[PDB]
Amino acid sequence: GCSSYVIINTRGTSEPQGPSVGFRTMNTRIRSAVSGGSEYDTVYPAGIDQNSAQGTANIVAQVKAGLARNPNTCFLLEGYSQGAAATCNALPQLTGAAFDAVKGVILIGNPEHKPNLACNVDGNGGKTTFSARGISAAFTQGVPSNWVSKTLDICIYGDGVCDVSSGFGITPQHLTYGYNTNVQTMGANFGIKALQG
Numbered sequence: 001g002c003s004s005y006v007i008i009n010t011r012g013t014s015e016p017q018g019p020s021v022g023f024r025t026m027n028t029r030i031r032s033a034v035s036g037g038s039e040y041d042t043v044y045p046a047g048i049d050q051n052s053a054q055g056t057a058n059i060v061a062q063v064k065a066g067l068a069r070n071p072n073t074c075f076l077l078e079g080y081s082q083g084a085a086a087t088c089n090a091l092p093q094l095t096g097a098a099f100d101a102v103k104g105v106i107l108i109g110n111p112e113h114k115p116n117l118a119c120n121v122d123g124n125g126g127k128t129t130f131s132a133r134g135i136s137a138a139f140t141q142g143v144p145s146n147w148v149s150k151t152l153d154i155c156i157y158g159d160g161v162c163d164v165s166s167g168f169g170i171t172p173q174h175l176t177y178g179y180n181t182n183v184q185t186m187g188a189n190f191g192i193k194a195l196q197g
């Protein structure tokens with residue numbers, strides 16, 4: 001059980017610099033159930049930059065800075081949209097102690113969504129987006145094999161960002177994760193169990 005943890009939250013699109021709309025509810029439940037938490041909101045020019053390399057670097061730096069403060073610090077990594085891509089890009093850079101410290105990765109509307117990974121669920125926890133390809137999947141690696149068992153990759157059916165077969169680009173579905181009640185429940189239960197286990 002993690003006594004001290006950081007929720008690293010990497011936002012999307014044109015969300016303002018601050019907590020993403022996508023995780024607000026599940027985080028209230030995680031922080032309420034598991035003492036010792038804090039939130040770091042990844043600094044990067046979301047919807048203003050050419051890419052998210054800055055977001056990836058700040059995810060990696062905050063994991064390393066937290067472990068330096070307290071080597072038993074745990075992490076949950078959360079990414080929405082371009083922030084889910086930036087989170088996926090961080091995963092290969094988090095090795096040994098830094099890998100062991102990250103207890104769970106929650107992705108919503110992931111542009112790097114990859115077909116047939118065990119972490120893939122839809123908004124209702126089923127398989128309607130299980131084999132889906134994300135809009136960035138042809139050019140990126142998505143969730144590496146060694147991260148699948150601690151990842152939850154939620155793709156709402158009709159979200160063209162994580163499932164190119166059910167929508168073209170940013171579809172209204174892409175915008176709905178923060179007020180999807182089963183998304184928030186799945187995220188909260190995954191994060192609580194990751195930190196307590």
Ligand code: NA
Pocket residue numbers: 122123124128155156157
């Ligand atoms: Na769905």
